[PDB]
């Protein structure tokens, strides 16, 4: 996608919020801890206990958004991710087959019916005596 | 890989939009009960009738239309000293016997 | 550990740039004006240099700082043309009965959308190399030739024009909105004379820049089309 | 981090015209004294003469093979300031959100002056109150106004200066034997001979204990233009 | 401030009078009946041009 | 799943010794990848390719001991041992005791 | 006044006893030239690549961001302690040498500057070629227009050929140079 | 010499076997009058000298050009009329 | 004529004369039709990439001499312009409250004619040649020159 | 198999073509090649609007320490002499501004009469 966006089209930095599905959950996990057991009485805060790098999986993520910044192949996307990288693109490139190859020929023919008979071959001929060519957007009228 | 708009939305809200328009336009002529068919004439019922009369031949063609009027302005006095109808229809039957 | 940001403290060019400014309203002569547009532009490139060198800083917010300044500047183009549309539609009950002549349907229309349409194509073909960090040299020079071809042609047409500005609204308002957007061509025309291959690639605002505008200005030509030719 | 912008090219490795022209010197010069880009080249040029060695490896000890890859045997000292600095760092550009601090265990304020500048929303849910900003200053066992939330300031100060992973490694990496320049000759020999280098960064090294411009194709390797 | 204003005050000044005086035709052209009325010529070249 | 698959830094490779990219304008040269693959050969076809790490047999009893002392890192050792150690594989390995 | 400004060099030995750096061009170390080296290596003269030889001066530009680098010691030119220190800077340059500095601080207004005008040449190129012909007849006679509409309002469409040259036949009359142009027949 | 990432695929040394002398950049060291910079081989700074020189020569030949139109020429709207503008030759004013 | 080849094979030859569909049909020929220092991002590209790249390029590239044609026809027609009837000057046209002075503010140049009225220029011209003062354009016939769009 | 110059030879047919096309297909690769593309590198690389805005900043030096002079420097004068130069150079014109500013006003101020104030009821 063109327009750039932290959470999802982020490429100036390639920052990712979870680590790849390749990976084993016993290798690399998303950051979630939310479905940790309730810690014994007996045990003792020894770390801040504040949301960082202290957490092994956080850690992993920040690890891996460096260190994957050098690949030696490249990660072939799926053609579905290809054809949105250009969609529009493509699309202006078909918009412009269309006025060639169709908005062009029928204009001719109208441009050339209306120097035999006034007016284009898809509006009313007038018979107020009034002359020249007239409206070209019939339903508009 | 996340989307914000609708998958189509490009197309989606430009051609929704006119069909809305389109369709809400015809409701309001019914409601109002408007003429809907078109005339691309204007409606001067005598300039009319002189133009059928220069169809049916009775007024000569090319006869101008302030050749044919009860007053006419000081600009269509200065035309009327120079208007020859006669001889624009002899110069376009010369033209075309030449194209034949 | 380091300050999030590094302050700029000190700065000369906005002087300079508001004198110049001044420059174009108190002077006697146009001769001036115009070399005083000239130290504008220079002035306005250093500030650009500025923001090139800004890079070192290795800010991760500054490019979407940036991106971010460009929509609402876009923002602010859409809605100067607006209120020229505006202006057009205002009067609409005067138009059409009134003894001038528009403009046809056929000719300027259509090889008009047909060129804006490949000036489309090229820069799209540019952002495609831009993703694949390659470079292709004709592609600027298509533009170039583009952009003679369509000064060519609206030269011609206000020349052979026969309706002036003086002779109602309607052509009025025909010249002052095609005008309007000529100018945003021309300053496109100053956006991609200094266009090159950079090797820091998609950290550069000035590609996603020149796509979203030259959209901007084709898109803005299609409005214009249907309003006043068809 | 989320904050750092993209990996330059020396973040991986560092060119070998950066490499000093003075061997000798640097692979007797003590870690305290030794520069980054000093430091970046003692640890390669000895880190990679060991681990293209492969007959030793088998027989050194992790401790011996730590010390010459440069690596820093953990501790808790060491793991302590390391994982606070990197607390530092993640809050630069990160949100501060954790437990509900109490006088057994006080919010922790990482800091590098003697005062860094702290919000308290609260506890969580209804307990959750409006930001009341105070001035975390050292020395003091700060108790919220409103929650009774105790916070306390951790300065990251160590004989005047602060935290830094070089001080780090300075205060607790212990100086091994010195270096053995024949260990860098014989690895030399081992893998560039006949005009294939197999070892770069060791061709390069010999070359400048040679004194420059000595072993084949080194002079125009060092002949530039411009 | 007075030193710099010296030069402009005296090239807008002469600039002044002659704008008064009239059009840079309307000066060519006063130019031009001058040397008609010198040569006693109803029609003179162009300057710049021969006869 | 960044930049399009596109490594911001990666290695390429050029047979010819006294090559530049920058200074030379011949048109036959063909650089290489990481893995040697020539740039002409598309990377769809290249990335199905297999390529694993070979290190000297000089390495093996290293290799060896290695899994010996840290059974968890067996596996990955004798992968790398026997010449079945991909870059993924290595992969999981480094992020595995981080 | 300094022997920097007395002899212009690039990369000398007593950069800081000379006094001043003169030189805007940053990096070095290419094997060749026109090869990869390091710095971004950009001057007003002897960069790039020469368009009479074909052939490449300098390397392209090694960034000193992501995608590149630092330059290594043995070939900066730029020292910053000299670079900086512009402590009575005026008397070290003198007159000519502060005309000089500014006139090689707008190196990137004169890089744009080489870019912009020629396109707008070939713009100026347009008006000037038209304006020196004579205008065509926008206008003619309202009455005369629609007593010979057809043949006036449709002539182009059916024979441009000699609807150019009746144009032609008309602006000789209209401007009284009739019988000194032979117009060519159709 | 380029980026750590280019590389030769087969990483080979030549062995030179002519004689020239060493380039003496090739085989220099830091000094204390050189820091920095001393295997890059010094060069003439002509940026200094033809900057000034050649804006000098073109201000003074736009400026002359100038002056002389507008004052070696008759007097018009504009430097195209006062060169292309006068009236038909044989039409006396 | 030759005969070693077929009639379908001849006709591609030609339309590869400039190397276009070789380049289509083989990447190496693509890639080493690249400047070396863009070649060395190639191997990185998808065949989809590619092929969809040159689609794009050779659409643009081929319709370059449609929209030439096209912009042909517009400068003749504009050459050869017809004229048209003289306005009559109704009941709000061709009003003005100041004269036209806003291109020349001190020259003042052709006050009464509007800024690209060129028949009123013109006339305006002659008069400031005719009083001694050159004025620039409107002097060639438009058959007599380059570029014009109107011969026959 | 025989790898021929790239762009010399088609793939298309097995003919190689006759006289006319085999030049036609040689001398346009040349063009392209050696020719065309001289302008595209010379523009590419001569004249790099980003590589002038580097244009006299200092090396960034690969020991991190040696490059405080980013935040030590406003970026404005990251260019030395010539920067505090150009600095230098447009202050000199502000005397000269203020005159030619001053006359405007004179200008005005005596076009509209206001200098007669006295003088119209004496
Ligand atoms: C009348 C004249 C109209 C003129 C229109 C001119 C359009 C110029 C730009 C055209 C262009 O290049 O668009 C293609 C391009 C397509 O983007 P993409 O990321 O490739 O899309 C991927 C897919 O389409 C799928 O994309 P996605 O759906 O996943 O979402 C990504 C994309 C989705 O968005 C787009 O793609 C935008 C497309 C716009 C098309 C317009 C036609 O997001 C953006 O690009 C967001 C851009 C920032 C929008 C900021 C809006 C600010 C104003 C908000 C309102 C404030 C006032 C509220 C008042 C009331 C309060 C109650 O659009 C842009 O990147 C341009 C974005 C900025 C446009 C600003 C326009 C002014 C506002
Ligand atoms: C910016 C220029 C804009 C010009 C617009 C003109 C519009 C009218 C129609 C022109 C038709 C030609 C194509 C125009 C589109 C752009 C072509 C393009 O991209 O070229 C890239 C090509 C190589 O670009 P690159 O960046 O190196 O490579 C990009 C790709 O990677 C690799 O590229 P590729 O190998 O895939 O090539 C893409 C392909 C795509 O184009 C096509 O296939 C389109 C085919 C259209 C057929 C229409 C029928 O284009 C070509 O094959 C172009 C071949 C051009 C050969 C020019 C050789 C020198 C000619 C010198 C003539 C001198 C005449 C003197 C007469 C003197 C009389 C006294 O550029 C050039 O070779 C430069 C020239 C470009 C074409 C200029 C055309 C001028 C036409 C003048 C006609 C004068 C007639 C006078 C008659 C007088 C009678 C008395
Ligand atoms: C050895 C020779 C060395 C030459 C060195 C460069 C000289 C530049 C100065 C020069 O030639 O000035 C006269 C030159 C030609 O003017 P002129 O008509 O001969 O004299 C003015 C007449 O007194 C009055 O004629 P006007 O009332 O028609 O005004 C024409 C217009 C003269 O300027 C233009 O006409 C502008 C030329 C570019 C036009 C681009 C139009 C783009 C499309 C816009 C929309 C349609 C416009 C349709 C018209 O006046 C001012 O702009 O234009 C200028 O005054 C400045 C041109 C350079 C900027
Ligand atoms: C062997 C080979 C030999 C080869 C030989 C030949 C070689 C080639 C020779 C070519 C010669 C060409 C000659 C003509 C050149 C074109 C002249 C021109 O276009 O101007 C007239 C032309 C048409 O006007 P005109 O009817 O000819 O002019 C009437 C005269 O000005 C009548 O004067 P006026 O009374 O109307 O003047 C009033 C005064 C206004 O007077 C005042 O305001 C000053 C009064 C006080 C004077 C004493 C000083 C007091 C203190 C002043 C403090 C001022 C600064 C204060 C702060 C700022 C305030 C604004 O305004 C001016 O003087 C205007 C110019 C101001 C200076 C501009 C910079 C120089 O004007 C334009 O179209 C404007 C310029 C457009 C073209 C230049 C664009 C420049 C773009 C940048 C790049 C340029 C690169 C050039 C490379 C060239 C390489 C060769
Ligand atoms: C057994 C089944 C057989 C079926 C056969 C189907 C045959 C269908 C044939 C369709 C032919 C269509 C021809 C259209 C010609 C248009 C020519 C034309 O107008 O050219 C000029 C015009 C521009 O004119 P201007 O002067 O600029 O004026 C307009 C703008 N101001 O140019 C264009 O429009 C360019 C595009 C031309 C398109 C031509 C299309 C030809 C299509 C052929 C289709 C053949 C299909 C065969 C199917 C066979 C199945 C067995
Ligand atoms: C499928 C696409 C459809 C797009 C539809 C866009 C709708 C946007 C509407 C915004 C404004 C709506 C206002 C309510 C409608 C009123 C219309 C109306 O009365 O128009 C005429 C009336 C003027 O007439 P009077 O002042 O009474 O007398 C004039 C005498 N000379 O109002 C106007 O001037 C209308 C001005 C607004 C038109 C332009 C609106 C914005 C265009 C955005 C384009 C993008
Ligand atoms: C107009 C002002 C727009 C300001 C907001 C956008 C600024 C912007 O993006 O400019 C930078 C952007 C790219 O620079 P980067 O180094 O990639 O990014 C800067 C650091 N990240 O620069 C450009 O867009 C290039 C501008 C070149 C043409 C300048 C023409 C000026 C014309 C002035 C006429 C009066
Ligand atoms: C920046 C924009 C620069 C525009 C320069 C061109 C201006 C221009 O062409 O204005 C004329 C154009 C057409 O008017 P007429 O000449 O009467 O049309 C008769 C057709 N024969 O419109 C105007 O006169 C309005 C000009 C407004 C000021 C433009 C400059 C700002
Ligand atoms: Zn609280």
Same mark, same amino acid.
């Given at each position: 996608?063109?327009?750039?966006?932290?959470?999802?089209?982020?490429?100036?930095?390639?920052? +990712?919020?979870?680590?790849?599905?390749?990976?084993?959950?016993?290798?690399?996990?998303?950051?979630?801890?939310?479905?940790?057991?309730?810690?014994?009485?007996?045990?003792?805060?020894?770390?801040?206990?504040?949301?960082?790098? +202290?957490?092994?999986?956080?850690?992993?993520?920040?690890?891996?958004?460096?260190?994957?910044?050098?690949?030696?192949?490249? +990660?072939?996307?799926?053609?579905?991710?290809?054809?949105?990288?250009?969609?529009?693109?493509?699309?202006?490139?078909?918009?412009?087959?269309?006025?060639?190859?169709?908005?062009?020929?029928?204009?001719?023919?109208?441009?050339?019916?209306?120097?035999?008979? +006034?007016?284009?071959?898809?509006?009313?001929?007038?018979?107020?005596?009034?002359?020249?060519?007239?409206?070209?957007?019939?339903?508009?009228? | 890989?996340?989307?914000?708009?609708?998958?189509?939305?490009?197309?989606?809200?430009?051609?929704?939009?006119?069909?809305?328009?389109?369709?809400?336009?015809?409701?309001?002529?019914?409601?109002?009960?408007?003429?809907?068919?078109?005339?691309?004439?204007?409606?001067?019922?005598?300039?009319?009738?002189?133009?059928?009369?220069?169809?049916?031949?009775?007024?000569?063609?090319?006869?101008?239309?302030?050749?044919?009027?009860?007053?006419?302005?000081?600009?269509?006095?200065?035309?009327?000293?120079?208007?020859?109808?006669?001889?624009?229809?002899?110069?376009?039957?010369?033209?075309?016997?030449?194209?034949? | 550990?380091?300050?999030?940001?590094?302050?700029?403290?000190?700065?000369?060019?906005?002087?300079?740039?508001?004198?110049?400014?001044?420059?174009?309203? $108190?002077?006697?002569?146009?001769?001036?004006?115009?070399?005083?547009?000239?130290?504008?532009?220079?002035?306005?490139?250093?500030?650009?240099?500025?923001?090139?060198?800004?890079?070192?800083?290795?800010?991760?917010?500054?490019?979407?700082?940036?991106?971010?300044?460009?929509?609402?500047?876009?923002?602010?183009?859409?809605?100067?043309?607006?209120?020229?549309?505006?202006? $057009?539609?205002?009067?609409?009950?005067?138009?059409?009965?009134?003894?001038?002549?528009?403009?046809?349907?056929?000719?300027?229309?259509?090889?008009?959308?047909?060129?804006?349409?490949?000036?489309?194509?090229?820069?799209?073909?540019?952002?495609?190399?831009?993703?694949?960090?390659?470079?292709?040299?004709?592609?600027?020079?298509?533009? $170039?030739?583009?952009?003679?071809?369509?000064?060519?042609?609206?030269?011609?047409?206000?020349?052979?024009?026969?309706?002036?500005?003086?002779?109602?609204?309607?052509?009025?308002?025909?010249?002052?909105?095609?005008?309007?957007?000529?100018?945003?061509?021309?300053?496109?025309?100053?956006?991609?004379?200094?266009?090159? $291959?950079?090797?820091?690639?998609?950290?550069?605002?000035?590609?996603?820049?020149?796509?979203?505008?030259?959209?901007?200005?084709?898109?803005?030509?299609?409005?214009?089309?249907?309003?006043?030719?068809? | 981090?989320?904050?750092?912008?993209?990996?330059?090219?020396?973040?991986? @490795?560092?060119?070998?015209?950066?490499? *000093?022209?003075?061997?000798?010197?640097?692979?007797?010069?003590?870690?305290?004294?030794?520069?980054?880009?000093?430091?970046?080249?003692?640890?390669?040029?000895?880190?990679? @003469?060991?681990?293209?060695? *492969?007959? @030793?490896?088998?027989?050194?000890?992790?401790?011996?093979?730590?010390?010459?890859?440069?690596?820093?045997?953990?501790?808790?000292?060491?793991?302590?300031?390391?994982?606070?600095?990197?607390?530092?760092?993640?809050?630069? #550009?990160?949100?501060?959100? #954790?437990?509900?601090?109490?006088?057994?265990?006080?919010?922790?304020?990482? @800091?590098? #002056?003697?005062?860094?500048?702290?919000?308290?929303?609260?506890?969580?849910?209804?307990?959750?109150?409006?930001?009341?900003?105070?001035?975390?200053?050292?020395?003091?066992?700060?108790?919220?106004?409103?929650?009774?939330?105790?916070?306390?300031?951790?300065?990251?100060?160590?004989?005047?200066?602060?935290?830094?992973?070089?001080?780090?490694?300075?205060?607790?990496?212990?100086?091994?034997?010195?270096?053995?320049?024949?260990?860098?000759?014989?690895?030399?020999?081992?893998?560039?001979?006949?005009?294939?280098?197999?070892?770069?960064? #060791?061709?390069?090294?010999?070359?400048?204990?040679?004194?420059?411009?000595?072993? *084949?194709?080194?002079?125009?390797?060092?002949?530039?233009?411009? | 401030?007075?030193?710099?204003?010296?030069?402009?005050?005296?090239?807008?000044?002469?600039?002044?009078?002659?704008?008064?005086?009239?059009?840079?035709?309307?000066?060519?052209?006063?130019?031009?009946?001058?040397?008609?009325?010198?040569?006693?010529?109803?029609?003179?070249?162009?300057?710049?041009?021969?006869? | 799943?960044?930049?399009?698959?596109?490594?911001?830094?990666?290695?390429?490779?050029?047979?010819?010794?006294?090559?530049?990219?920058?200074?030379?304008?011949?048109?036959?040269?063909?650089?290489?990848?990481?893995?040697?693959?020539?740039?002409?050969?598309?990377?769809?076809?290249?990335?199905?390719?297999?390529?694993?790490?070979?290190?000297?047999?000089?390495?093996?009893?290293?290799?060896?001991?290695?899994?010996?002392?840290?059974?968890?890192?067996?596996?990955?050792?004798?992968?790398?041992?026997?010449?079945?150690?991909?870059?993924?594989?290595?992969?999981?390995?480094?992020?595995?005791?981080? | 006044?300094?022997?920097?400004?007395?002899?212009?060099?690039?990369?000398?030995?007593?950069?800081?006893?000379?006094?001043?750096?003169?030189?805007?061009?940053?990096?070095?170390?290419?094997?060749?030239?026109?090869?990869?080296?390091?710095?971004?290596?950009?001057?007003?003269?002897?960069?790039?690549?020469?368009?009479?030889?074909?052939?490449?001066?300098?390397?392209?530009?090694?960034?000193?961001?992501?995608?590149?680098?630092?330059?290594?010691?043995?070939?900066?030119?730029?020292?910053?302690?000299?670079?900086?220190?512009?402590?009575?800077?005026?008397?070290?340059?003198?007159?000519?040498?502060?005309?000089?500095?500014?006139?090689?601080?707008?190196?990137?207004?004169?890089?744009?500057?080489?870019?912009?005008?020629?396109?707008?040449?070939?713009?100026?190129?347009?008006?000037?070629?038209?304006?020196?012909?004579?205008?065509?007849?926008?206008?003619?006679?309202?009455?005369?227009?629609?007593?010979?509409?057809?043949?006036?309002?449709?002539?182009?469409?059916?024979?441009?050929?000699?609807?150019?040259?009746?144009?032609?036949?008309?602006?000789?009359?209209?401007?009284?140079?009739?019988?000194?142009?032979?117009?060519?027949?159709? | 010499?380029?980026?750590?990432?280019?590389?030769?695929?087969?990483?080979?040394?030549?062995?030179?076997?002519?004689?020239? %002398?060493?380039?003496?950049?090739?085989?220099?060291?830091?000094?204390?009058?050189?820091?920095?910079?001393?295997?890059?081989? %010094?060069?003439?700074?002509?940026?200094?000298? %033809? %900057?000034?020189?050649?804006?000098?020569?073109?201000?003074?030949?736009?400026?002359?050009?100038?002056?002389?139109?507008?004052?070696?020429?008759?007097?018009?709207?504009?430097?195209?009329?006062?060169?292309?503008?006068?009236?038909?030759?044989?039409?006396?004013? | 004529?030759?005969?070693?080849?077929?009639?379908?094979?001849?006709?591609?030859?030609?339309?590869?004369?400039?190397?276009?569909?070789?380049?289509?049909?083989?990447?190496?020929?693509?890639?080493?039709?690249?400047?070396?220092?863009?070649?060395?991002?190639?191997?990185?590209?998808?065949?989809?990439?590619?092929?969809?790249?040159?689609?794009?390029?050779?659409?643009?590239?081929?319709?370059?001499?449609?929209?030439?044609?096209?912009?042909?026809?517009?400068?003749?027609?504009?050459?050869?312009?017809?004229?048209?009837?003289?306005?009559?000057?109704?009941?709000?046209?061709?009003?003005?409250?100041?004269?036209?002075?806003?291109?020349?503010?001190?020259?003042?140049?052709?006050?009464?004619?509007?800024?690209?009225?060129?028949?009123?220029?013109?006339?305006?011209?002659?008069?400031?040649?005719?009083?001694?003062?050159?004025?620039?354009?409107?002097?060639?016939?438009?058959?007599?020159?380059?570029?014009?769009?109107?011969?026959? | 198999?025989?790898?021929?110059?790239?762009?010399?030879?088609?793939?298309?047919?097995?003919?190689?073509?006759?006289?006319?096309?085999?030049?036609?297909?040689?001398?346009?690769?040349? !063009?392209?090649?050696?020719?065309?593309?001289?302008?595209?590198?010379?523009?590419?690389?001569?004249?790099?609007?980003?590589?002038?805005?580097?244009?006299?900043?200092?090396?960034?030096?690969?020991?991190?320490?040696?490059?405080?002079?980013?935040?030590?420097?406003?970026?404005?004068?990251?260019?030395?002499?010539?920067?505090?130069?150009?600095?230098?150079?447009?202050?000199?014109?502000?005397?000269? !501004? !203020?005159?030619?500013?001053?006359?405007?006003?004179?200008?005005?101020?005596?076009?509209?009469?206001?200098?007669?104030? !006295?003088?119209?009821?004496?």
């Amino acid at each position: 996608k063109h327009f750039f966006t932290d959470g999802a089209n982020d490429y100036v930095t390639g920052w +990712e919020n979870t680590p790849p599905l390749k990976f084993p959950a016993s290798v690399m996990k998303p950051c979630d801890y939310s479905m940790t057991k309730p810690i014994p009485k007996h045990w003792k805060l020894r770390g801040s206990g504040i949301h960082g790098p +202290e957490n092994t999986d956080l850690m992993k993520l920040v690890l891996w958004n460096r260190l994957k910044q050098k690949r030696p192949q490249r +990660e072939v996307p799926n053609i579905n991710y290809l054809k949105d990288s250009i969609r529009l693109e493509l699309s202006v490139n078909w918009w412009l087959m269309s006025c060639i190859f169709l908005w062009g020929p029928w204009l001719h023919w109208g441009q050339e019916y209306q120097k035999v008979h +006034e007016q284009p071959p898809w509006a009313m001929k007038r018979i107020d005596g009034l002359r020249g060519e007239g409206y070209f957007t019939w339903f508009l009228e | 890989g996340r989307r914000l708009l609708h998958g189509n939305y490009f197309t989606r809200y430009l051609f929704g939009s006119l069909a809305v328009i389109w369709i809400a336009e015809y409701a309001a002529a019914c409601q109002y009960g408007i003429p809907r068919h078109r005339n691309p004439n204007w409606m001067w019922s005598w300039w009319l009738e002189k133009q059928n009369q220069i169809k049916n031949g009775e007024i000569p063609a090319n006869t101008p239309g302030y050749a044919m009027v009860k007053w006419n302005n000081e600009a269509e006095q200065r035309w009327l000293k120079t208007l020859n109808v006669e001889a624009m229809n002899e110069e376009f039957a010369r033209r075309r016997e030449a194209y034949y | 550990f380091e300050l999030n940001i590094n302050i700029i403290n000190y700065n000369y060019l906005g002087i300079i740039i508001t004198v110049i400014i001044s420059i174009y309203i $108190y002077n006697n002569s146009n001769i001036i004006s115009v070399y005083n547009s000239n130290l504008l532009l220079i002035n306005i490139n250093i500030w650009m240099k500025y923001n090139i060198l800004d890079m070192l800083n290795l800010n991760v917010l500054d490019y979407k700082i940036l991106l971010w300044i460009v929509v609402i500047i876009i923002s602010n183009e859409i809605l100067l043309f607006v209120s020229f549309y505006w202006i $057009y539609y205002h009067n609409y009950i005067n138009y059409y009965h009134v003894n001038i002549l528009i403009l046809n349907s056929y000719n300027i229309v259509y090889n008009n959308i047909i060129l804006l349409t490949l000036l489309s194509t090229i820069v799209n073909i540019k952002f495609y190399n831009y993703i694949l960090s390659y470079y292709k040299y004709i592609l600027s020079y298509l533009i $170039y030739y583009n952009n003679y071809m369509f000064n060519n042609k609206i030269i011609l047409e206000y020349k052979n024009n026969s309706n002036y500005t003086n002779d109602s609204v309607y052509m009025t308002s025909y010249f002052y909105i095609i005008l309007l957007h000529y100018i945003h061509i021309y300053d496109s025309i100053i956006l991609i004379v200094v266009y090159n $291959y950079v090797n820091y690639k998609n950290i550069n605002n000035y590609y996603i820049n020149i796509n979203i505008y030259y959209h901007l200005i084709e898109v803005l030509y299609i409005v214009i089309s249907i309003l006043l030719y068809l | 981090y989320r904050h750092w912008h993209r990996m330059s090219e020396d973040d991986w @490795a560092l060119p070998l015209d950066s490499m *000093p022209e003075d061997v000798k010197t640097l692979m007797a010069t003590p870690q305290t004294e030794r520069g980054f880009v000093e430091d970046y080249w003692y640890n390669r040029i000895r880190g990679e @003469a060991t681990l293209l060695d *492969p007959e @030793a490896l088998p027989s050194k000890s992790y401790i011996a093979l730590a010390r010459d890859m440069g690596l820093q045997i953990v501790d808790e000292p060491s793991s302590h300031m390391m994982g606070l600095i990197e607390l530092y760092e993640y809050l630069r #550009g990160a949100s501060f959100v #954790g437990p509900f601090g109490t006088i057994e265990n006080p919010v922790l304020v990482p @800091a590098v #002056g003697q005062e860094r500048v702290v919000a308290c929303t609260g506890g969580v849910g209804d307990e959750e109150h409006f930001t009341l900003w105070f001035r975390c200053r050292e020395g003091f066992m700060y108790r919220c106004g409103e929650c009774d939330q105790i916070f306390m300031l951790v300065r990251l100060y160590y004989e005047d200066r602060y935290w830094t992973q070089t001080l780090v490694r300075d205060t607790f990496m212990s100086d091994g034997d010195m270096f053995d320049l024949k260990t860098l000759e014989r690895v030399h020999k081992m893998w560039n001979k006949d005009e294939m280098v197999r070892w770069e960064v #060791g061709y390069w090294a010999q070359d400048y204990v040679l004194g420059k411009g000595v072993l *084949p194709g080194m002079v125009e390797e060092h002949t530039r233009v411009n | 401030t007075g030193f710099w204003f010296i030069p402009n005050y005296i090239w807008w000044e002469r600039r002044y009078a002659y704008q008064k005086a009239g059009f840079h035709w309307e000066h060519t052209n006063r130019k031009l009946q001058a040397r008609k009325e010198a040569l006693g010529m109803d029609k003179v070249p162009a300057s710049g041009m021969d006869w | 799943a960044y930049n399009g698959g596109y490594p911001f830094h990666y290695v390429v490779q050029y047979d010819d010794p006294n090559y530049d990219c920058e200074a030379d304008f011949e048109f036959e040269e063909i650089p290489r990848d990481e893995f040697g693959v020539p740039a002409h050969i598309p990377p769809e076809l290249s990335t199905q390719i297999r390529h694993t790490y070979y290190v000297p047999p000089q390495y093996y009893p290293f290799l060896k001991k290695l899994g010996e002392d840290t059974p968890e890192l067996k596996p990955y050792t004798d992968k790398l041992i026997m010449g079945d150690m991909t870059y993924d594989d290595y992969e999981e390995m480094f992020y595995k005791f981080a | 006044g300094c022997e920097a400004v007395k002899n212009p060099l690039i990369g000398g030995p007593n950069q800081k006893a000379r006094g001043a750096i003169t030189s805007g061009f940053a990096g070095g170390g290419a094997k060749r030239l026109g090869g990869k080296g390091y710095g971004i290596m950009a001057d007003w003269c002897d960069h790039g690549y020469s368009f009479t030889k074909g052939q490449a001066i300098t390397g392209m530009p090694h960034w000193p961001l992501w995608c590149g680098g630092g330059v290594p010691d043995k070939f900066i030119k730029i020292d910053p302690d000299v670079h900086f220190n512009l402590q009575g800077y005026r008397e070290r340059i003198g007159w000519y040498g502060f005309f000089t500095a500014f006139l090689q601080a707008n190196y990137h207004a004169f890089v744009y500057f080489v870019r912009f005008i020629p396109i707008n040449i070939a713009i100026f190129w347009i008006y000037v070629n038209e304006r020196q012909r004579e205008p065509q007849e926008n206008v003619m006679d309202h009455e005369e227009f629609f007593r010979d509409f057809d043949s006036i309002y449709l002539g182009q469409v059916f024979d441009h050929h000699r609807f150019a040259e009746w144009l032609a036949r008309r602006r000789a009359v209209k401007w009284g140079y009739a019988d000194q142009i032979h117009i060519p027949p159709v | 010499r380029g980026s750590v990432f280019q590389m030769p695929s087969t990483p080979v040394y030549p062995l030179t076997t002519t004689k020239k %002398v060493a380039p003496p950049t090739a085989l220099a060291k830091r000094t204390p009058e050189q820091p920095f910079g001393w295997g890059s081989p %010094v060069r003439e700074d002509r940026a200094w000298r %033809v %900057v000034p020189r050649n804006f000098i020569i073109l201000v003074i030949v736009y400026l002359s050009g100038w002056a002389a139109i507008k004052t070696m020429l008759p007097r018009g709207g504009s430097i195209l009329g006062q060169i292309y503008g006068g009236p038909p030759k044989g039409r006396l004013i | 004529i030759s005969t070693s080849e077929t009639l379908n094979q001849k006709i591609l030859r030609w339309l590869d004369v400039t190397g276009m569909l070789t380049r289509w049909h083989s990447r190496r020929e693509f890639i080493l039709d690249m400047d070396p220092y863009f070649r060395k991002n190639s191997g990185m590209w998808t065949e989809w990439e590619r092929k969809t790249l040159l689609f794009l390029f050779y659409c643009c590239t081929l319709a370059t001499p449609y929209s030439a044609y096209l912009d042909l026809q517009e400068l003749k027609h504009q050459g050869t312009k017809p004229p048209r009837p003289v306005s009559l000057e109704s009941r709000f046209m061709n009003q003005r409250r100041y004269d036209f002075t806003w291109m020349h503010p001190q020259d003042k140049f052709c006050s009464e004619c509007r800024p690209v009225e060129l028949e009123c220029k013109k006339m305006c011209f002659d008069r400031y040649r005719s009083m001694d003062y050159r004025m620039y354009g409107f002097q060639r016939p438009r058959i007599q020159t380059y570029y014009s769009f109107s011969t026959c | 198999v025989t790898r021929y110059p790239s762009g010399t030879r088609t793939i298309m047919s097995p003919y190689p073509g006759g006289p006319v096309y085999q030049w036609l297909r040689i001398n346009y690769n040349y !063009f392209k090649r050696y020719q065309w593309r001289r302008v595209g590198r010379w523009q590419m690389r001569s004249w790099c609007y980003w590589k002038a805005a580097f244009y006299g900043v200092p090396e960034w030096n690969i020991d991190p320490t040696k490059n405080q002079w980013r935040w030590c420097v406003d970026p404005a004068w990251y260019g030395g002499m010539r920067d505090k130069a150009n600095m230098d150079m447009y202050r000199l014109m502000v005397y000269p !501004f !203020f005159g030619y500013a001053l006359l405007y006003l004179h200008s005005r101020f005596k076009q509209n009469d206001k200098y007669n104030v !006295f003088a119209k009821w004496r």
